[PDB]
Design a protein around this ligand. Structure first.
Ligand SMILES: Nc1nc2c(N)ncnc2[nH]1
Ligand SMILES: Nc1nc2c(N)ncnc2[nH]1
Ligand SMILES: Nc1nc2c(N)ncnc2[nH]1
Ligand SMILES: Nc1nc2c(N)ncnc2[nH]1
Lengths: 225, 225
């Protein structure tokens, strides 16, 4: 499988670019796509930009232009669940939006129209990475076009998804796009903050570590795949 | 210019498909793209699906695969401003998200990270359609991954954007994607409801009319372009 690897920010893609063999760059519509191999696997790496729209466009271009067979999404997120420490890794076995409301038509809160409420990382990828797995957790990552920085927002999100482990701005968008384009995806994150009132401060301090930790898990997964 | 034309729902693309000359269909990653000409213009038509992610993927595929030169986005929206009647048309001279909060890093409410707060329909397209222009208005359309159906939500949105004329789920996403991919876009909508407690009921009754009215304005624009 040719694997597309997406990260929202440069800090989250840097470590992987450093491990890219026979690296080449291809500029497509103003963004750079890195091609080459990682431990034998044909990959395309891309820093998508932040949020639902930028994520969705990278998936579409990876699918249509680069003809990838699978996707891995890596980066940092905010820790919200019991037992999840800053620096921990979360493998998303489910993904959902925490900021979607089409309930007027009967959909569940969080469920986008003409979509399932929950998307999932590919089950075989999840089984394999668990085996290769750093303190880590398996569970729900909730996505929204918002940077969560307050207990009031955390509690709002938990009132809809009590089992949420972490929050961030792209996961469910990448999974929605991947599912629409018929591609398996694996979503991995490392915690840079607690999504609380200080979230922006700790995100700034720990983004590089979190980006690297998530990337290290991705590399361990590719070594075993 | 080869023009990509995007509508979220089938009801919003049907009238245009009926006016497509030498119509052909091309299936790309599970979605149908209609090619041909409308009043001499080379077009590609696509029903993107609902919401930010589906919109963004259609723009990316239109850009990268079909190599379009411009985009027109058409459909229905909910009327929220003074003087805007159900059935009226709104040409969006500005677009912004009403559901985005990255204020923790200093961005304005509604402003996505690494993006402007307001996107705009291409100024030359707006000048031309005004000339070709049905009761209609020129102003802000606010976008969110939510179907607005309550005065409480309307008032929430207006507290952030007092000049908002209508609300819907794709405009600003299409404009964000178009801007990122360096393509001019024109956003047009016809009102199917008032985004109030009955919004889903009136949307169901008037979606076909609204889809057609917006499409008729788009056709008048192409006839003059
Ligand atoms: N409405 C809805 N609830 C669920 C659930 N508990 N699990 C999966 N899909 C769902 N869809
Ligand atoms: N690393 C990271 N932290 C967060 C947060 N608190 N909210 C949204 N996205 C994020 N991404
Ligand atoms: N923060 C911010 N305010 C504005 C405004 N009033 N107009 C355009 N761009 C903006 N960006
Ligand atoms: N036609 C239409 N009405 C609406 C509404 N009230 N909210 C969001 N999108 C919409 N689209």
């Amino acid at each position: 499988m040719k694997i597309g690897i997406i990260a929202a920010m440069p800090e989250e893609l840097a470590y992987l670019v450093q491990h890219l063999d026979n690296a080449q760059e291809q500029v497509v519509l103003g963004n750079t796509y890195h091609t080459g191999t990682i431990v034998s696997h044909e990959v395309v790496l891309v820093e998508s930009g932040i949020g639902k729209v930028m994520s969705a466009m990278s998936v579409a271009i990876l699918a249509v232009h680069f003809q990838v067979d699978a996707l891995i999404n890596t980066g940092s997120a905010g820790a919200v669940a019991e037992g999840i420490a800053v620096g921990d890794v979360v493998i998303a076995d489910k993904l959902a939006y925490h900021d979607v409301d089409v309930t007027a038509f009967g959909y569940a809160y969080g469920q986008m129209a003409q979509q399932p409420l929950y998307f999932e990382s590919d089950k075989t990828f999840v089984a394999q990475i668990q085996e290769s797995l750093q303190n880590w957790h398996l569970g729900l990552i909730a996505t929204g076009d918002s940077f969560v920085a307050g207990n009031d927002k955390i509690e709002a999100i938990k009132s809809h998804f009590p089992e949420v482990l972490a929050v961030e701005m792209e996961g469910a968008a990448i999974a929605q796009a991947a599912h629409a384009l018929n591609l398996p995806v694996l979503v991995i994150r490392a915690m840079s903050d607690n999504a609380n009132h200080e979230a922006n401060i700790f995100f700034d301090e720990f983004i590089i570590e979190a980006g690297r930790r998530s990337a290290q898990v991705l590399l361990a997964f590719l070594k075993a795949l």
